[PDB]
Amino acid sequence: PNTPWQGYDINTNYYETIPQTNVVREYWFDIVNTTAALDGVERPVLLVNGQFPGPTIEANWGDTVKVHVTNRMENNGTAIHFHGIRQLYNNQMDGVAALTQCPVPPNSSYTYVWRAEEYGSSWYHSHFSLQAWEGVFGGILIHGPSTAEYDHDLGMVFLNDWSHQTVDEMYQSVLESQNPPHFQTGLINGSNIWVTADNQTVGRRFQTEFVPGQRYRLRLVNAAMHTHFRFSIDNHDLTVIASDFVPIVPFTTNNVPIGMGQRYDIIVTANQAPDNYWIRAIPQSFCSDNANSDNIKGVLHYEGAADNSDPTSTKWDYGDDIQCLDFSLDELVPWLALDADIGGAQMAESDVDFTPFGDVPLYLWTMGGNALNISWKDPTLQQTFEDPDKMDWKASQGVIEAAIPNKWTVLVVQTDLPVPHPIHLHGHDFYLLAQGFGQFNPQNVTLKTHNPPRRDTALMTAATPENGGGGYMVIGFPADNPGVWLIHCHIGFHATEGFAQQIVERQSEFNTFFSEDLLENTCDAWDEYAKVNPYGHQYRALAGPYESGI
Ligand SMILES: *[C@@H]1O[C@H](CO)[C@@H](O[C@@H]2O[C@H](CO)[C@@H](O[C@@H]3O[C@H](CO[C@H]4O[C@H](CO)[C@@H](O)[C@H](O)[C@@H]4O)[C@@H](O)[C@H](O)[C@@H]3O)[C@H](O)[C@H]2NC(C)=O)[C@H](O)[C@H]1NC(C)=O
Ligand SMILES: *[C@@H]1O[C@H](CO)[C@@H](O[C@@H]2O[C@H](CO)[C@@H](O)[C@H](O)[C@H]2NC(C)=O)[C@H](O)[C@H]1NC(C)=O
Ligand SMILES: [Cl-]
Ligand SMILES: [Cu+2]
Ligand SMILES: [Cu+2]
Ligand SMILES: [Cu+2]
Ligand SMILES: [Cu+2]
Ligand SMILES: [K+]
Ligand SMILES: [Zn+2]
Ligand SMILES: [Zn+2]
Ligand SMILES: [Zn+2]
Ligand SMILES: [Zn+2]
Ligand SMILES: [Zn+2]
Ligand SMILES: [Zn+2]
Ligand SMILES: [Zn+2]
Ligand SMILES: [Zn+2]
């Protein structure tokens, strides 16, 4: 109705129908090695063109988006994933090193061409080792229909945990120990204050200004390394209007529990007394180890000033900030109602465990029997191009086949440990059938199949040690998208340690998107770089910084 998607609305099946705008958006990203003082302490970061939040990819529903990525670092390769982007018959643009491409080496490039076949909020980031968490990420905002109206779109709001030592600096101590990583702090959209060792304050807090009476869209993204956050705005109400790329029936709440890799679209109404209010992102202590959960805040400033002054507002009393949880299954109802259709589906189960390896012990996460051990130098797609009808997978490849077109897969991702994990499926919106605590008993647990929640990242929740630990999440998806899709824990360190598996989906029909050149050119350049730079060689052993390959 005077929109760039005229002739479609909130009720259009975006899995089947894509607006043809014939418009190409085009971005040039130089991935750089540098330095940044995000809370006023200097430390190394790796960045998209020098900015933290990387610049945002903006598109309208239905557009083609073309991201020219160039590696201008000296000691990392790169590969860039557009999280939540479906890549329908476009697998090779999904940017998972060791699956869909070789890593792009310094001074080489890779042009990502993908279609905007969803609308909503997400982000792109590296899928190359720990790099997304060095800062190689930025938002994706695809304009489209909304399930509630608002007045102003404030864009992305990123929530990270943060340390003054590098995620790569801490990696080796993470692997050699069974306790979680420790983070000093957090940032909201890349800012926070910081104070130590003098009582001097450095950096600054996030701030936005609401004009009274106005309705704002905020698009939350948990971009953190190892934190599940609960987000709120003192005295204000939040109207959840979408989960990941899927718009839901609006509903209000005090706080948004937000898992790593997840997005929530939020409408907030300047309907409180024009004053100053805490914006809070609080680490959930069951699965978050932060030194500063009280102090990851930002200022909501109402136009009717009170400038330069802190807020004095009280946090919503909503219970503890302990357990790491998703909105419940019934709270997340997709506006496009589609259901799970699991009749006669390939049933599958994957255990999640945390096991030691080698004489040092390195403690590795392990998904469906093995910790992933694949090869930058030899991505799956090369394997399947060299051998079209390959069936001899190696267990440490974490293959789960779905070779029959349009057949569903109902997967159980389950654990015995009192440790919860965000689980993200590439190439798909999965249908979230069950979610719970303790062990999963297919007789006692009732699968929601009628218009269940639909998204790309959801928690495998876990019970606390006093309640016996353990947990499971159940997902289902049709084989509707040929390609090799990573399925994995969205926690950085876990996925690098092997907490990842690969859907080898519709293998026969890889020729439907596969380009020899797009593959070879990059792999040759990466091979070229490995001959001269020690960092071109994937460390895969057990006395150093292990990389599963993704
Ligand atoms: C968190 O950080 C993000 C990145 O640092 C912030 O992203 C910004 O989000 C807003 C909301 O979508 C965008 O606003 C738009 O800007 C584009 C481009 O604007 C520029 O070019 C036009 C001409 O094409 C010019 O007229 C403008 O003055 C600008 O020079 C517009 O086309 C859109 O219609 C819209 O106005 C920003 O572009 C976006 N920036 C980046 C770098 O992605 C985000 O705001 C931060 N979140 C909060 C809450 O602060
Ligand atoms: C970013 O730049 C830094 C500084 O040049 C790189 O780190 C150094 O790495 C070399 C090679 O391993 C070492 O010999 C130096 O001692 C390091 N110096 C410091 C200050 O750490 C780093 O590898 C680069 N990162 C990339 C290319 O992604
Ligand atoms: Cl842990
Ligand atoms: Cu992601
Ligand atoms: Cu993804
Ligand atoms: Cu995990
Ligand atoms: Cu991923
Ligand atoms: K070679
Ligand atoms: Zn819009
Ligand atoms: Zn961990
Ligand atoms: Zn004014
Ligand atoms: Zn003011
Ligand atoms: Zn059916
Ligand atoms: Zn063969
Ligand atoms: Zn139904
Ligand atoms: Zn060559």
Q: CB burial class (10 A; 0-12, 13-18, 19+) of residue 446?
A: exposed
Does the beta carbon of 73 lie inside 6 Å of ligand 2? yes
Compute, in angstroms, the gap from residue 511 CA to the centroid of ligand 1.
39
Residues 54 and 11 in one domain: yes
Task: Please tell me the residue having the least CA distance from ligand 2 atom 3.
Answer: 33
296's torsion region: left (phi>0), alpha (psi -120 to 50) or beta?
A: beta
Residues 207 and 348 in one domain: no
Compute, in angstroms, the gap from residue 423 CA to the centroid of ligand 10.
14
In angstroms, rounded to a whole number, what is the distance separating the alpha carbons of residues 425 and 102?
A: 20
Task: Please tell me the residue having the least CA distance from ligand 2 atom 21.
Answer: 44
| 280 three-state secondary structure | strand
Q: Which is the closest atom of ligand 1 to the Cα of 157?
A: 47
Residues 531 and 400 in one domain: yes
- The backbone torsions φ and ψ at residue 217, rounded to the nearest 5 degrees and listed phi first, read -95, 130
Classify strands 54-60 and 137-143 as parallel, antiparallel or unpaired: parallel
In angstroms, rounded to a whole number, what is the distance separating the alpha carbons of residues 234 and 280?
A: 8
Q: Which residues are annotated as a binding site?
A: 81, 83, 125, 127, 143, 153, 209, 226, 301, 303, 307, 339, 341, 387, 389, 421, 424, 426, 450, 488-490, 494, 528
| Amino acid identity, position 493 | F
In angstroms, rounded to a whole number, what is the distance separating the alpha carbons of residues 362 and 390?
A: 32
Contact 168/110 with Cβ under 8 angstroms?
Answer: no
* Domain-ending residue, one of 101, 130, 145: 145
Contact 191/206 with Cβ under 8 angstroms?
Answer: yes
In angstroms, rounded to a whole number, what is the distance separating the alpha carbons of residues 332 and 174?
A: 35
Q: Which is the closest atom of ligand 1 to the Cα of 51?
A: 5
| 292 three-state secondary structure | coil
Residues 13 and 67 in one domain: yes
Q: How far is CA 374 from CA 119, 315, 380, 491, 547, in A?
A: 33, 46, 8, 18, 9
Q: How far is CA 428 from CA 64, 97, 479, 520, 532, in A?
A: 19, 18, 9, 26, 38
| 154 three-state secondary structure | strand
Pick from 75, 104, 129, 134 the residue to mutate for probing ligand 2's pocket: most ligand atoms within 8 Å of its CB.
75
In angstroms, rounded to a whole number, what is the distance separating the alpha carbons of residues 388 and 410?
A: 26
In angstroms, rounded to a whole number, what is the distance separating the alpha carbons of residues 401 and 407?
A: 11
In 76-197, which ranges are continuous DSSP H helix?
A: 167-175
Compute, in angstroms, the gap from residue 496 CA to the centroid of ligand 7.
11
SS3 of 316-376: CCCCCCCCCCCCCHHHCCECCCCCCCCCCCEEEEEEEEEEEECCCCEEEEEECCECCCCCC
Residues 119 and 150 in one domain: no
Question: Which residue in the block uniquely carries the two structure tokens 């590969």?
Answer: 79
Neighbours of ion ligand 9 (CB under 5 A): 143
Compute, in angstroms, the gap from residue 493 CA to the centroid of ligand 10.
6
In angstroms, rounded to a whole number, what is the distance separating the alpha carbons of residues 100 and 210?
A: 43
Task: Please tell me the residue having the least CA distance from ligand 2 atom 7.
Answer: 75
Pick from 25, 47, 52, 58 the residue to mutate for probing ligand 1's pocket: most ligand atoms within 8 Å of its CB.
58
Question: Which residue in the block uniquely carries the two structure tokens 């000296």?
Answer: 74
Residues 493 and 366 in one domain: yes
Does the beta carbon of 141 lie inside 6 Å of ligand 1? yes
Q: For residue 386, give the H/E element and its range.
A: helix 380-386
Q: Give residues with Cβ within 8 angstroms of 72, minimum separation 6.
A: 30, 31, 32, 33, 106, 107
Residues 111 and 158 in one domain: no
Count H helices and E strands in the chain, helices first.
Answer: 4, 32
In angstroms, rounded to a whole number, what is the distance separating the alpha carbons of residues 103 and 523?
A: 7
In angstroms, rounded to a whole number, what is the distance separating the alpha carbons of residues 438 and 160?
A: 29
Q: How far is CA 212 from CA 178, 252, 275, 409, in A?
A: 49, 19, 10, 49
Does the beta carbon of 46 lie inside 6 Å of ligand 2? yes
Residues 379 and 424 in one domain: yes
Does the beta carbon of 49 lie inside 6 Å of ligand 1? no
Angle (CA) 210-211-217 rounded to 5° is 45
Kindly report the number of other CB atoms within 10 A of residue 145's CB atom. 17
Total structural domains in the chain? Answer: 3
- The backbone torsions φ and ψ at residue 173, rounded to the nearest 5 degrees and listed phi first, read -85, -35
Q: Which is the closest atom of ligand 2 to the Cα of 535?
A: 12
Range of the domain at 51: 1-145
Residues 210 and 64 in one domain: no
Contact 161/225 with Cβ under 8 angstroms?
Answer: yes
Q: Which is the closest atom of ligand 2 to the Cα of 534?
A: 12
Beta bridge partners of 201: 195
In angstroms, rounded to a whole number, what is the distance separating the alpha carbons of residues 262 and 248?
A: 14
Q: Which is the closest atom of ligand 2 to the Cα of 106?
A: 27
Contact 352/366 with Cβ under 8 angstroms?
Answer: yes
Does the beta carbon of 203 lie inside 6 Å of ligand 1? no
Compute, in angstroms, the gap from residue 212 CA to the centroid of ligand 11.
10
The CATH number of residue 293's host domain is: 2.60.40.420
Contact 167/134 with Cβ under 8 angstroms?
Answer: yes
Q: Which is the closest atom of ligand 1 to the Cα of 153?
A: 11
Contact 511/60 with Cβ under 8 angstroms?
Answer: no
Q: Give residues with Cβ within 8 angstroms of 418, minimum separation 6.
A: 462, 463, 464, 465, 469, 470
Closest CA to 483 of 428, 528, 421, 546: 428
In angstroms, rounded to a whole number, what is the distance separating the alpha carbons of residues 266 and 351?
A: 34
Compute, in angstroms, the gap from residue 173 CA to the centroid of ligand 3.
12
Compute, in angstroms, the gap from residue 528 CA to the centroid of ligand 8.
7
In angstroms, rounded to a whole number, what is the distance separating the alpha carbons of residues 533 and 106?
A: 10
Compute, in angstroms, the gap from residue 341 CA to the centroid of ligand 15.
9
In angstroms, rounded to a whole number, what is the distance separating the alpha carbons of residues 427 and 435?
A: 21
Compute, in angstroms, the gap from residue 343 CA to the centroid of ligand 4.
30
* Domain-ending residue, one of 296, 320, 336: 336
Residues 390 and 507 in one domain: yes
Q: How far is CA 330 from CA 276, 290, 432, 438, 454, in A?
A: 34, 31, 11, 20, 12
Residues 242 and 125 in one domain: no
Closest CA to 421 of 472, 474, 362: 472
| Amino acid identity, position 505 | E
- Resolution in Å, one decimal place: 2.7
* Domain-ending residue, one of 305, 336, 367: 336
Task: Please tell me the residue having the least CA distance from ligand 2 atom 17.
Answer: 75
| Amino acid identity, position 339 | D
Contact 58/65 with Cβ under 8 angstroms?
Answer: no
Kindly report the number of other CB atoms within 10 A of residue 445's CB atom. 15
Residues 303 and 239 in one domain: yes
Contact 547/371 with Cβ under 8 angstroms?
Answer: no
Angle (CA) 163-164-170 rounded to 5° is 65
Closest CA to 257 of 189, 322, 334, 196: 322
| Amino acid identity, position 321 | D
- Elucidation method: X-ray
